[PDB]
Structures are given as structure tokens and as C-alpha cells.
Design a protein around this ligand. Structure first.
Ligand SMILES: c1csc(CNCc2ccncc2)c1
Length: 460
């Protein structure tokens, strides 16, 4: 039975509005409703992995698991296995997988982050799950960020606290946050970003939604504008939105947006908004294709509609050779030549690199680089041809060309990372000097760049 080189992943996010679900929620898992929807001819084909994020979830874990499993069994006639379930207050993530994948899934991690301080601590935050699927690491984050149209900056802060403090994936990747620990990272939830138009325009916005004319609304969506200004979700992708705003509906219909201020809303307006989102970040040159992104039309117990997204995702097998794992394969080598880091720091410490990869027995520390001043005010750290030759555990090009090298640039004085990035080994050529590049981030914000040349030797 051959190992897969692709899987499909379902991501759902639903803010349930503290109400039990209706008796049938199959449309959610079938990617049916509005937006980029799934073809009817696929309805019986199970996804490999289903990841369900809820917010304002009133059910116990047991009650929700029974509903989810019975929903999937009705659609697919497959009894899914529970990989993980994790709940923080009323924020929950469930991961289900086809039974044939049970032996392929390992290193299962869960965590949560509580956002805010005092007043703002007690209901918002994130849950996450990570695991290995054969040779591929997968991470999933369900966040419920701060509400309210005038709190985009707090949402951005919530995002940075979650990616800093959520402890998922390989704890040996110590300089790296969740935005670098996984082959594929999916981040979804009630992100709570709003359409930033005047209150007086509410009925105009409703009109536009009835005409399915979303362009002048999306141009005011805070998540798209904050992303375009590099204030949040740097280096994440989102499929184009082609479904109506998913919030705020009158319950038991989808015919009415309930936007006006009420005591129950703290006297806040809730103009129709795309609160409910799915974003992703995959390592460079790994296959990831969004095959659906939309909202259901027929699940009306909440003031939000459920959102679905589905993906093709490249995966790799758990490779064994006669040499690695448990030794190096002397027929393989990675050389980083004429590399330099450009840093936005005003610090004048010396810097060294760490190279981390599951193709190495352990991470590799470089010598210190040579600091120079850049012409427009920056620090350039030059490494020359000084960098240690990396010795991969396996030299087979079928394995090595699918790997990635994480790079951290650390201060000699403090050992703290000033920037993290990732280089694909999916090169155009072996035994050939080729340009490489990654942006460097720290706490998910841009701190610099790393560029130079690579020369990869495989067994072929
Ligand atoms: C439910 C869905 S995944 C899972 C974990 N499976 C661990 C494993 C067991 C044997 N061999 C390889 C991996 C439980």
C-alpha cells in the first residue's frame, strides 16, 4: 500500500454564538453554500484530515465529537479517528483523520494561549494542534481575537502574542515560533476584523451584499488592509473571498444582517464583516492549493455562518536509507557560499547562524560573521565561505530536494534570535552554485533578509 505524496485537508471555522447546532451540518463538511465551493461529484470522497475550529462553543467535547463523527460518517460512510481535541474556555479545535492514517500520524501536540490582561483576560485566545504526517509537519491554530470595529490594533497584538507563546511542534527548534515550525501551518478562527466603513453606510453595505457586489466592501476589510500594510499575518496566504460577510446575522434565517447597536452588543454597531477566516503558510516550493473557500447558507443557529476551506497539501514519506537515520550519508552535502544577512537592528553585537533541519542529526552553529554598515543605515553581516558544510543524514535526491533549512541569526552577546527564515532545497540543479533568499522575521515581524548562494550535493 503506497504512501501518499498528497493529502486533502478540510479546515472549518464557526463561531456558534453559544447556541447548539442544528440537526444537520453536512453542508459545512461538503464545502457547499457561497464562495468557492466543492463539486457535487466529490461529495462521497473523504478528506484525509478534518480540522474543526469553533468559538463561543457551548457543547462539551463529547457532545461535539459525537456530532462531528456522525456527520462525517453520514457523508462518507467512514468512521474517522480522533487525532486531538483541545478546548480553552469556549474556543475548541478537533482534528479527525481517516483510519488508514492512524499509523502515519505521530508527535501530536496541543496548546493554548490566553490573550489580554485583567479586563481583557478570560475569553479570547487560541488553541492549536500539531503533528507529523509521515515526513511532513502540520500545524493548526484556531484563534478568537478581540471583537469590535475600533480594535484592529488589539487584534494584531493578539496575533503576535499567539504566535510567540503557542508551544507546538519540535521543541528543539528553539529559535523558531510556530510560523517556521511546520511544513504547512493553517491559522483560522473568528479573527474579528471588520469592514471599516461609516455606521451611516449600513443599509448601503446590505444592498451591495444582496447584489453580490463585494469589491468595495473587501477594499475596506481590516484584515486585507492590515496584511497589505504588513501589520499582521506577514507571509501568510488567503484565498480570494467570494462569499457574503459571515457576521452579524439574525439567528434562524440568513435574510437579515443585525448590525444596529443594542445593550446586548455594549451599544456597538456590528456592520457586516468577514470575521471568520482561514489563512495558511507553507514552506517555500511545497505544493499547497486551496480547492474551496466559502460559507454555508443553511446553518443558522448562530449570528455567524460557518466557513470552510479545503487544501491539497504535499507530503513526504518517512525515509530510511542504509546510512541515515542514525548516521550521516557522506555522498550528501549542503554548502552556503557568500551569504550575508541584512538586519534592521541598531545593535552592534557580533552575530552567528544556526541551521536547523530534520535532514541533519542536530542543528549546526556557524562562526561569527563580519559586520559592515549598509549604505542606507543598515547592518550587513557577511559570512564569506566560512560557513560549516552541512552533512545530511540521507543523500538520495528524492529525499534531499524535498527538505528545508531553517536559519536563525543570533547575537553572540545574548544568544537571542534577531531573525528567522527558511530556505528550500528544491533547487533547479545540484553541484551548481544557485542564488538563495529568505526574509528574516522575529516575533512574526520583518527584521531583515538572508541571501547568498547554495551548492547541494546528492547521491545523483
Ligand atoms: C488517532 C489518530 S492518529 C493517532 C496517533 N497514532 C500514533 C501511531 C501509532 C502507531 N504507529 C504510528 C503512529 C491516534
Amino acid at each position: 500500500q503506497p504512501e501518499p505524496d498528497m493529502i486533502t485537508i478540510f479546515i472549518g471555522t464557526w463561531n456558534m454564538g453559544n447556541a447548539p447546532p442544528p440537526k444537520k451540518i453536512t453542508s459545512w463538511f461538503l464545502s457547499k453554500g457561497q464562495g468557492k465551493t466543492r463539486d457535487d461529484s466529490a461529495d462521497y470522497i473523504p478528506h484525509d484530515i478534518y480540522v474543526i475550529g469553533t468559538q463561543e462553543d457551548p457543547l462539551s467535547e463529547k457532545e461535539w465529537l459525537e456530532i462531528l463523527k456522525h456527520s462525517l460518517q453520514e457523508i462518507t460512510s467512514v468512521t474517522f479517528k480522533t487525532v486531538a481535541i483541545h478546548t480553552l474556555w469556549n474556543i475548541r479545535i478537533v482534528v479527525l483523520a481517516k483510519p488508514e492514517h492512524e499509523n502515519r500520524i505521530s508527535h501530536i501536540c496541543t496548546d493554548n494561549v490566553k490573550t489580554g490582561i485583567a479586563n481583557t483576560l478570560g475569553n479570547k485566545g487560541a488553541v492549536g494542534v500539531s503533528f507529523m504526517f509521515n515526513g511532513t509537519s502540520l500545524g493548526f491554530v484556531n484563534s478568537h481575537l478581540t471583537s469590535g470595529s475600533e480594535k484592529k490594533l488589539r487584534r494584531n497584538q493578539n496575533y503576535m502574542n499567539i504566535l510567540r507563546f503557542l508551544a507546538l511542534g519540535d521543541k528543539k527548534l528553539s529559535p523558531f515560533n510556530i510560523t517556521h515550525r511546520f511544513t504547512h501551518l493553517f491559522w483560522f478562527g473568528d479573527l474579528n476584523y471588520r469592514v471599516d466603513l461609516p455606521t451611516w453606510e449600513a443599509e448601503t453595505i446590505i444592498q451591495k451584499i444582496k447584489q453580490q457586489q463585494y469589491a468595495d466592501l473587501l477594499s475596506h476589510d481590516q484584515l486585507l488592509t492590515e496584511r497589505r500594510e504588513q501589520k499582521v499575518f506577514l507571509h501568510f496566504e488567503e484565498e480570494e473571498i467570494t462569499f457574503a460577510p459571515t457576521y452579524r446575522f439574525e439567528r434562524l434565517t440568513r435574510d437579515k444582517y443585525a448590525y444596529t447597536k443594542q445593550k446586548a452588543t455594549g451599544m456597538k454597531y456590528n456592520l457586516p464583516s468577514w470575521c471568520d477566516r482561514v489563512l495558511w503558510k507553507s514552506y517555500p516550493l511545497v505544493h499547497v492549493v486551496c480547492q474551496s473557500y466559502g460559507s454555508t447558507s443553511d446553518i443558522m443557529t448562530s449570528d455567524h455562518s460557518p466557513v470552510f476551506a479545503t487544501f491539497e497539501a504535499g507530503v513526504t514519506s518517512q525515509f530510511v536509507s542504509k546510512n541515515g537515520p542514525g548516521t550521516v550519508d557522506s555522498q550528501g552535502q549542503i554548502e552556503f557560499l557568500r551569504c550575508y544577512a541584512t538586519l534592521k537592528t541598531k545593535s552592534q553585537t557580533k552575530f552567528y547562524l544556526e541551521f536547523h533541519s530534520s535532514c541533519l542529526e542536530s542543528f549546526v552553529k556557524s562562526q561569527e560573521g563580519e559586520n559592515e554598515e549598509g549604505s542606507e543605515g543598515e547592518l550587513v553581516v557577511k559570512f564569506g565561505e566560512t560557513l560549516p558544510k552541512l552533512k545530511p543524514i540521507i543523500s538520495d535526491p528524492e529525499y534531499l530536494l524535498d527538505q528545508h533549512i531553517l536559519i536563525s541569526i543570533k547575537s553572540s552577546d545574548s544568544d537571542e534570535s534577531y531573525g528567522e527564515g527558511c530556505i528550500a532545497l528544491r533547487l533547479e540543479a545540484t553541484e551548481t552554485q544557485l542564488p538563495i533568499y529568505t526574509p528574516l522575521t522575529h516575533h512574526g515581524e520583518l527584521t531583515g533578509h538572508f541571501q547568498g548562494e547554495i551548492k547541494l550535493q546528492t547521491s545523483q
